[PDB]
């Protein structure tokens, strides 16, 4: 006969009242529920819990299912449980600020998240297509990174304490992003006999390339056999972007400030699962090894992602 | 001046000829390339490698990019490298057949893949939307599971040697599947004052439910506060399916054959990362603990996924 009124949400915006008894578990009476970070599905409602807001993760109403699809986009059924679990596990992590630069301190093999996050921090005019990603992005810019860390890990299928691939995660996250201004990428494919074909990429698709790590290797002419029997070529003919991200496999490269490289920053893989985020500032390389800075003018390192400023190119 | 002709593919169907010198790496001249399982991007082409078929993973032509989008569906840029790497790492795994039942032997924390695969093996009339998933599914049914294991791991973002969640992977894989016949799921939401709302689910969406582990808990009436001030209910009103998969959080349940349960099979989590696939056959529970069988009539276990036969229900 004793009951408690609880408020149920999936978004912290819309709430439904559920009347619960104190003779059965939360899982039996309602479903998977989180309260102030912890999963209380296997607990029996306590009189003190009346009026509290609970986060449900399964057995959602039609209205809850729609709100979820609009907030997170299409997600698998375990998404909410993984996101709320991640959010709780990641709470103790520390974002430190070294000379106004936010870096994720080392804990539970999170070093790849440092390279990912610090790289996203340099990407000008990027909005997130998924509202929940945009809210956590904005909270991260304000000084509270928990939501963003957990959502990236949730969308990337990253396990707490497990090492991962920075490039994998960066591109996965960036597939859910949009560009505020406009960008173009024109790849011309041709045979002097068969004809010319132009392929046009717009938005942030024009700002990311995987398989090349220099603007020279990007702009280089590619040649292979044509159907006619002659030569077929592929070459980048137009490129207009607010920034440029080029990614590749760990590749030894002597990085020096003496030649003033056109790139702004780069990530490095060291080997297991170790990542370092480097930036070019004041004629130096600032190496951010998970909330630990080190400055050098020259570095021979296994380069992965390389960030360049805006492109204004015509072949 | 010495050159070799190599054949480049992303699908083993369409091939392009590339002329390569023996004075530069494969990565420099073409890109990320795999040959007979191994990544040879950092090797210099050898005269003996002329006429061989190479699998490229980055710097794809427009025609290769389109063929890839049609074969695998939209995938992140690291997909091919992870799939080819996984394919190579997983080669030594063994599928054993115990009394005509295929089960994945234990190796590199693959136990969750055993629960996933053995569960998919019972799902009648399922086709895969993504062609590459359908080809590997068909190869798996024929006795060669490598491609299927690696693709599930590739789409699920599973790392070789790392433990994972069977339910996560099952639903992820099943989101890329379709049903050959037809299924219906009708959820009625109502207030005796505000009115009735029917929500209809079709295909294999009507065959999967997360948050409930019994057909009784599924069919149970859910009640919460309506906007009007009265009671609002949610109840399953129609259900027609060729099979039914119900998933939940590990939940202790005494499973007995004495009551002849309506379900056909179920998965169990034991705890870390350990999974067991159980089937109901001949008045017994056959426990498949990664290519190891054990028979019992009663089992008190932390049940996750539960598979039921076709549903023919009207409330
Ligand atoms: Zn031609
Ligand atoms: Zn009402």
Automatic annotation (TrEMBL), chains A, B:
PTM annotation (Cysteine persulfide): residues: 111
Residues with Cysteine sulfenic acid (-SOH) modification: 111
Start and end residues of each Peptidase C16 domain: 71-315
Location(s) in or outside the cell: Host cytoplasm, Host perinuclear region; Host membrane
Binding site for Zn(2+) 1: 191, 194, 226, 228
Ranges of residues in domain Ubiquitin-like: 1-56
Role description: Plays a role in the initial induction of autophagosomes from host endoplasmic reticulum. Later, limits the expansion of these phagosomes that are no longer able to deliver viral components to lysosomes.
Record family assignment: Belongs to the coronaviruses polyprotein 1ab family.
Protein name: ORF1a
Origin species: Human betacoronavirus 2c (isolate EMC/2012) (HCoV-EMC)
Gene assigned in the entry: orf1ab
Full protein: residues contained: 1482 to 1800 of 4391
